[PDB]
């Protein structure tokens, strides 16, 4: 059914363009990551990985 919009409509009836981001952060191969600079890898020493 028609979902028209008029500029005379007040708050609660104005159009609201909604975009939702869905994440799947879980044990699975990472493809999207933040801008964290990857450093050299060290072994056999206690490190905050």
């Amino acid at each position: 059914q028609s979902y028209g919009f008029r500029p005379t409509y007040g708050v609660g009836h104005q159009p609201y363009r909604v975009v939702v981001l869905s994440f799947e952060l879980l044990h699975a191969p990472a493809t999207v990551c933040g801008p964290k600079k990857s450093t050299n890898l060290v072994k056999n020493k206690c490190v905050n990985f």
Partner: protein, 49 residues
């Protein structure tokens, strides 16, 4: 002619099948926050009054 806050307009609701989904066009509905009764499945409850 909605009454002033100091003298609020109280109304009695009697035996009726009230659909809380057709009222959505009756107001802008700036805020529809609700307490212990969620409005979501509000049409499946029976009230004393």
């Amino acid at each position: 002619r909605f009454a002033s806050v100091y003298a609020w307009n109280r109304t009695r609701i009697s035996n009726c099948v009230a659909d809380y989904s057709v009222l959505y066009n009756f107001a802008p509905f700036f805020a529809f926050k609700c307490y212990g009764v969620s409005p979501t499945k509000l049409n499946d409850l029976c009230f004393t009054n």
